[PDB]
Amino acid sequence: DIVLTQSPSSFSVSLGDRVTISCKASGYILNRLAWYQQKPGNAPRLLISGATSLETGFPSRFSGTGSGKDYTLSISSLQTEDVGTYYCQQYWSTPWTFGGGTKLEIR
Amino acid sequence: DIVLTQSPSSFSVSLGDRVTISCKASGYILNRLAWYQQKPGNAPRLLISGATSLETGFPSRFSGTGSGKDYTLSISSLQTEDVGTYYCQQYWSTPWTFGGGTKLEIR
Amino acid sequence: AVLSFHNICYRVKEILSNINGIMKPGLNAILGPTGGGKSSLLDVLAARKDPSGLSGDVLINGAPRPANFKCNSGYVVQDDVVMGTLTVRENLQFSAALRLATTMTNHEKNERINRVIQELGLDKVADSKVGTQFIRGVSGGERKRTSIGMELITDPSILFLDEPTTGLDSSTANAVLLLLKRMSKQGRTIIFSIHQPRYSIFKLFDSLTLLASGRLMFHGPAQEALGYFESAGYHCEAYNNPADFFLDIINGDLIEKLAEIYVNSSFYKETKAELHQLSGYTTSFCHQLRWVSKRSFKNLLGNPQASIAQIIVTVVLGLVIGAIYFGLKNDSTGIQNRAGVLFFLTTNQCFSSVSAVELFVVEKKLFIHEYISGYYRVSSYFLGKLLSDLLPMRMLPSIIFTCIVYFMLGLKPKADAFFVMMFTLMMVAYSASSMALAIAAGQSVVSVATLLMTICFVFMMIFSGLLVNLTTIASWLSWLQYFSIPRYGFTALQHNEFLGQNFCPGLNATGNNPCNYATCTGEEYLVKQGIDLSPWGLWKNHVALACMIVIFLTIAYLKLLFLKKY
Amino acid sequence: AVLSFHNICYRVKEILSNINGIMKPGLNAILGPTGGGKSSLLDVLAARKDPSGLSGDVLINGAPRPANFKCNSGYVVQDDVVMGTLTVRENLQFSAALRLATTMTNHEKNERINRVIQELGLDKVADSKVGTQFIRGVSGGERKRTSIGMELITDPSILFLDEPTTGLDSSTANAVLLLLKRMSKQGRTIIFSIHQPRYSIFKLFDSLTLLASGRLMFHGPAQEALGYFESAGYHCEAYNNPADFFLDIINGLIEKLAEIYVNSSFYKETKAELHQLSGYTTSFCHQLRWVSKRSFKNLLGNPQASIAQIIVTVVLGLVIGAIYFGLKNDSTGIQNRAGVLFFLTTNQCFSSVSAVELFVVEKKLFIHEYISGYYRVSSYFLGKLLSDLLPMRMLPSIIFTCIVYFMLGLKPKADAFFVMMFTLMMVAYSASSMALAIAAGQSVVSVATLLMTICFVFMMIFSGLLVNLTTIASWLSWLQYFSIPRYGFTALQHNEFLGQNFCPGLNATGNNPCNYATCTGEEYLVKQGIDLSPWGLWKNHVALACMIVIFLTIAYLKLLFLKKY
Amino acid sequence: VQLQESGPGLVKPSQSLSLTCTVTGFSITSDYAWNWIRQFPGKKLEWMGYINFDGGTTYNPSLRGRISITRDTSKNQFFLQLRSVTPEDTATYYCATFYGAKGTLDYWGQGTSVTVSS
Amino acid sequence: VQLQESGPGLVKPSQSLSLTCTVTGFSITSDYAWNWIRQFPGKKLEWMGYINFDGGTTYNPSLRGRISITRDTSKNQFFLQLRSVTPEDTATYYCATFYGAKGTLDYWGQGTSVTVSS
Ligand SMILES: CC(C)C[C@H]1c2[nH]c3cc(OC4CCCC4)ccc3c2C[C@H]2C(=O)N[C@@H](Cc3ccccc3)C(=O)N21
Ligand SMILES: CC(C)C[C@H]1c2[nH]c3cc(OC4CCCC4)ccc3c2C[C@H]2C(=O)N[C@@H](Cc3ccccc3)C(=O)N21
Ligand SMILES: CC(C)CCC[C@@H](C)[C@H]1CC[C@H]2[C@@H]3CC=C4C[C@@H](O)CC[C@]4(C)[C@H]3CC[C@]12C
Ligand SMILES: CC(C)CCC[C@@H](C)[C@H]1CC[C@H]2[C@@H]3CC=C4C[C@@H](O)CC[C@]4(C)[C@H]3CC[C@]12C
Ligand SMILES: CC(C)CCC[C@@H](C)[C@H]1CC[C@H]2[C@@H]3CC=C4C[C@@H](O)CC[C@]4(C)[C@H]3CC[C@]12C
Ligand SMILES: CC(C)CCC[C@@H](C)[C@H]1CC[C@H]2[C@@H]3CC=C4C[C@@H](O)CC[C@]4(C)[C@H]3CC[C@]12C
């Protein structure tokens, strides 16, 4: 199948800081990549589709970039409300696979 | 090629009346049909795409219906501002063809 | 029964120049070198040659040959035409049923067959197969006695043979000739041609005829030939075969010298005097059809390898196709896989229908011999041979393929779709087979026909509707797509399959298409390929296939009808 | 030169039971029925048979046969092995170059050839083609004299023939036998087998040997055979050929005749005499050069086979260009591109079936020349590949590429052009090698053609068009690595689609609005299971090369372990 | 567009599992695809399968025959039937929605826990 | 997104024709396709051809070699070159836009008249 990998299983940053998150795929995905944001005790919420597009309901502080197998998510000047668990999903092949998670924290 | 035919080259109605306009194709079009509205001395303006969808900028008084080769446009309770020339276009095959025109009038 | 020919001169270059002679009851013979018109002369007297090139008169007891002479007499070919699969008794029954009159009861025909078997010494081998590549066979002598048996059924007064000894062993040849001499004692006239015989052979003869370059070097009793040559100025040393002596004389140890010598002889005088003294359907149609079909079916069952191998191969192919394409899914890859599998089925039918070339090509000589002899018409042969071999063997594989693959793959689960698929595959197979017959009928070479069929199919698959989209093709070249069988079959199958399919999960393109480039329904795929959605767009392919079948079969019948039987 | 055999007994059922005899300079002969081991005996004495089944001793002037005997002597086959295309003189030059020593100057070899031509009466037909299906041919007698010429080059003391008269006319046969009797006068031993000859033939003989069911019915001077049979209790009437008399006696016993002969005086004398008696040439490059030269001459001298294929490829290129003219970057571009590339690859694979005919046709000649010491297997194999296979497979690919690439409107770059050419070339070579491996060491063409067709048919399924390779189950997908069309088609697709956009007005490359559009070449490739890296282009080529190597090695092995006897 | 799971919060090993999702604001037979998703403790999302709007269904191969998804168009429900349960497959289960033109899981449920113990 | 035609309002027969459309608010090399359309007197719309965003072009077969469309990415222009003019092809010419995902001609120009006389 296609197995997605998020190298930073955990991070540690402060407000105003810039944080970057990455997902690596075992095959070519062709920008069929999505990012989900999950607060504890809540269902995941869609954040980005197509690896660049942004969903209405979120600030223009989240951006997506990537080509082929390497994709990244950029949070510029994170606030407190952005703390949580992030996942990368691929919707290219039918056995859709998520990432393992990238929990943010605060210093 | 694909030649589109509008049987009513002309009509004659009054305000509040309901008027129906039809386009016949020489081949199967699969709802790749569009309707344009043209006032005199102006460029045509898109009105309907997909034979059912309506573009933002027009009232919900225009409707489209049709399957295969037979398509119709419905103007329910026409006003004065709706008087003009209407065309049917097909964007299925590259030599895009328009209809001949269906000029509305007023009694 | 006496056969007399006078001033025979046959030209096509003349194979025969000037020939006179008479043949009376006994073991007449005809010798000479290969180019010497012994075979041509034998054909001329038997009437297996074009009368137009003839230039002389032929008589029988002072009466010219009638038009039913070929049917009445008997002619035995150098290469046996018997059916190896069938038994002696079956072949004799075939010949008796066709040649003899229908009024006669089957018991009388069986009596005649038994009499013939008794005469030829075949009682022990009546019910043993003649032999083939896969079947065990009887000796060549038994083959030849059987071939002669097929001709004596009608009890001919005159009997012709072409190189009866060639291809045999010495003892077998001597036995056959002794049998012929036994027959001649009963009162039958026998005429045959030999190639460099042995001395016992040359002694068994009662009359002799010699030829070279169409020139009658000698004619008369066999014994006097040596005396005539000795008196001519030639000498034969002991332990030298007289026939080889003659042939050596011809070679040069000249031709016109010998011809003039013979003209000056007394034998020519007597023959010319005697000549100048002398000068001054059977059955119905249904019967032929029934018996031809019966024989073809017996041969088909008695050669199990060819048919059973194809059946087993189709079963294996169905299993493999089911395994590879198992579980077709309604996603992006469903279109590709469906189109591919249907294309493969159609092209497999077209290409496996090449075996029909072998049908008429192999049995050409037998067909000619039996048509000349009056066994049957061309119509009966053609229709019976189609009804026996072509029909079942093309019908079964389509049913097997359909049954195996339809449910494994997961095509449309409806009875009508199932049967339409079966019917379309059947029609494709029949049309390709008819094409093959038309190409191969009236031929003896299998390679050229196979090559032509392969080339035609290859150029047909391009216009099938998968490799190239038919809409894009230029108008000055698109008309060629109406000469394709795979096109019609593939189009029918696509129409029967895609018409109710959705290939995009989560999206309704049928109702309205969000993106203009998606191909999320079967109808879009069909229209993009140039196919109509109306039912007529499904059945016009079938009517076209039927018209092709009719045209090709008519062409094959015509090619058989105008074939040169001589 | 005297050849003596004592108590020959050969078994495989024994074709020879017990045979004794000696052959001295002259026109020795061997007669009998077809099953009578006359051919087997001739092979045994010539050493063209398996020594293991032999059970007796063979001597030459009291000395056993050495291991170079087959090369030294001469053996003439029933069916002529000459090259119909070449001229008499060319064939003699071939034999002289290979059989004789390299040290000798070409002038001496030409002198020997001229001497041989003078002896055989071939001066007038030295430079006329022997004849073929498409070429006009000389008479069978000239063919046979040529075949004999190829053997006298090395000046053999002993000379063997198998049915020299069979397949000939009476006068031609007599002329050939008179020629042989002329040769025997010079001091050569000659041994041959005949089938039911004529009386002049039977008189020309000097010694006679008769066989039936592996039993020596008689041996001794030809004239005394009739007297021996008369004294045995048989009578021959006049105008009866003595040979036919013998054969009739055999037909009608066998053990009775064998015992009679054993009791005779001839057997006594032969046994006494026997008991009295008892008590590479050339380099490799030379062979390669001459084999290649001969194969090229034959190839040029059969223009139909090659020129027809070249013309057909040209016509096919024109037709393909016409049908697919002007490929468009729209929805139908993907379909048409895939179709045309698939057709090209499969056409190469299927047209590479002609290679079956290469080694199958010339099997008998190869065996005869290998036994006689002309060349090694390596030289034959490599030269015959280098001559015929290489150019004829290389040209059609170039023609197809040049014609279609610009007509259709594929990627206008030199690198893509040359990659396409190279890939088609490799596909053709690989399929031809497969065909050779299947067909080498065979005499039947039909079975090999059927096997090749079946293999190609099962290969096209896994090509990557009819069935998507991703969907195939894991327990069956591994079979896709045994497909040549797969590798060629994948390389061509990679070389073509990589820079293409198939949706007008839309940029799927940057970002895809609709998840189901297939608006780029990369999407099509990934959907088919193809990689976008350059290695995903060249691994197909390395796989094709490995297949080529494996198949050619298999063919060489199949030739090496073939039974030359 | 507005989903709500429901079902037992406790199951015995190797017996069965059945869940229910009710849809409001949309007809499940109209346009979309309807998925089932689970999140194990030690968060690790897994996709299980979906049932399209035409009744067609697709399942994750890792669940070989243990899973089946159905629907009742009368009241806009689609179900989950996960048989041969083990304590390993205790997790939080979600019902979600998949457009197809866009490709992402837009609308989710609140999620119901499931415990497999004894 | 905002187009504006320009060019001669008068042409001699069988000489040439050249027009210009300037785009503002978008780069013609970015996403869309850019068409040329004419409306004869006795209104009858005809589609002539387009030039895609990658430089590719497509023309109506009824105009066999008389038409060619180019572009200058420096200042966001695409041109029309209609050669071998006749009084028949006097009409009102428009530049338009074609998305491709949607399929329709959304944005048009104001239109410039062209007269072919002598
Ligand atoms: C045996 C074979 C698999 C079936 C069939 C067949 N199908 C084909 C499809 C082809 O292109 C297609 C294009 C898309 C993909 C495929 C090309 C060639 C062929 C041939 C060759 C043909 C033949 O040579 N002989 C006959 C009789 C026969 C049967 C069994 C044993 C011996 C003889 C026969 O049945 N085949
Ligand atoms: C002449 C022919 C068009 C070329 C070639 C060929 N290509 C094929 C492609 C096929 O399926 C493909 C699947 C997708 C669509 C197609 C099936 C069969 C064939 C054959 C048969 C083969 C043959 O029988 N002989 C050789 C030698 C030869 C050449 C010229 C004159 C005489 C003999 C030969 O070259 N062909
Ligand atoms: C010697 C051969 C080529 C003679 C001509 C045979 C072929 C080309 C003929 C025979 C039957 C014909 C078909 C008969 C019926 C129809 C239905 C019609 O609605 C479209 C044309 C179509 C499909 C014809 C096309 C041409 C056709 C296929
Ligand atoms: C749709 C299918 C069954 C059509 C198959 C066509 C068959 C029925 C056609 C093909 C060629 C035809 C034959 C061609 C020639 C003749 C000779 C004539 O004097 C009698 C009819 C007869 C013998 C025809 C009978 C019908 C025939 C066998
Ligand atoms: C008798 C035959 C079947 C022996 C085996 C031959 C075939 C199957 C072998 C020979 C060369 C091999 C290839 C050699 C190189 C590579 C590159 C690698 O990155 C993927 C596997 C691949 C593509 C191999 C697949 C298997 C292969 C194609
Ligand atoms: C892509 C191609 C050129 C790969 C190399 C293929 C050819 C040149 C290879 C494949 C099989 C090889 C042969 C394999 C076996 C032997 C036998 C040995 O005693 C002499 C060399 C010889 C005769 C080899 C010569 C080189 C050879 C013919």
Residue numbers in the entry:
A (entry chain E), B (entry chain C): 1 to 107
C (entry chain B): 35 to 46, 61 to 301, 328 to 354, 369 to 654
D (entry chain A): 35 to 46, 61 to 300, 328 to 354, 369 to 654
E (entry chain F), F (entry chain D): 2 to 119
Task: Reproduce the article's own wording on this structure.
ABCG2, also known as the breast cancer resistance protein (BCRP),1 is a clinically relevant ATP-binding cassette (ABC) transporter that limits the cellular penetration of toxins and drugs, thereby promoting physiological detoxification and contributing to multidrug resistance (MDR) in cancer cells. It is constitutively expressed in membranes of numerous tissues and tissue barriers, including the liver, the kidney, or the blood-brain barrier. Structural studies by cryo-EM have revealed the architecture and ligand binding pocket of ABCG2.11−14 The transporter is a homodimer, with each half consisting of a transmembrane domain (TMD) and a cytoplasmic nucleotide binding domain (NBD). When inhibitors bind, they occupy more space in the cavity and act as a “wedge”, preventing the TMDs from closing and the transporter from proceeding with substrate extrusion.
Of the four tetracylic ABCG2 inhibitors investigated here, AZ99 (7) stands out, as it combines high inhibitory potency (in particular, higher than for MZ82 (6)) with the absence of an ester group, which represents a metabolic weak spot of Ko143.28−30 Our cryo-EM structures confirm that AZ99 (7) binds to ABCG2 in a similar way as Ko143 (2). The two copies of Ko143 (2), MZ29 (3), and AZ99 (7) in all three cases form a “triangular wedge”, occupying almost the entire cavity volume. The phenyl rings of two F439 side chains, one from each ABCG2 protomer, stack against ring A of the inhibitors. AZ99 (7) and Ko143 (2) each form only one hydrogen bond involving the NH group of the indole ring and the oxygen of the side chain carboxamide group of N436. Thus, the new Ko143 analog AZ99 (7) is almost equipotent with MZ29 (3). AZ99 (7) was also found to fully abolish ABCG2-mediated transport of E1S into proteoliposomes at a concentration of 0.5 μM, as did Ko143 (1). Relative to MZ82 (6), the calculated binding affinity of Ko143 (2) is 0.25 kcal/mol higher; for AZ99 (7), it is 2.40 kcal/mol higher; and for MZ29 (3), it is 5.30 kcal/mol higher. The calculated relative binding free energies suggest that a cyclopentoxy group at the C-9 position and a tert-butyloxycarbonylethyl group at the C-3 position both increase the binding affinity relative to a methoxy group at C-9 and a benzyl group at C-3, with the cyclopentoxy group having a stronger effect. AZ99 (7) is a potent ABCG2 inhibitor with structural features (absence of an ester bond) that make it suitable and interesting for in vivo investigations, especially in light of promising in vivo activity of the inherently less potent MZ82 (6).28 The compound may have potential for both diagnostic and therapeutic applications.
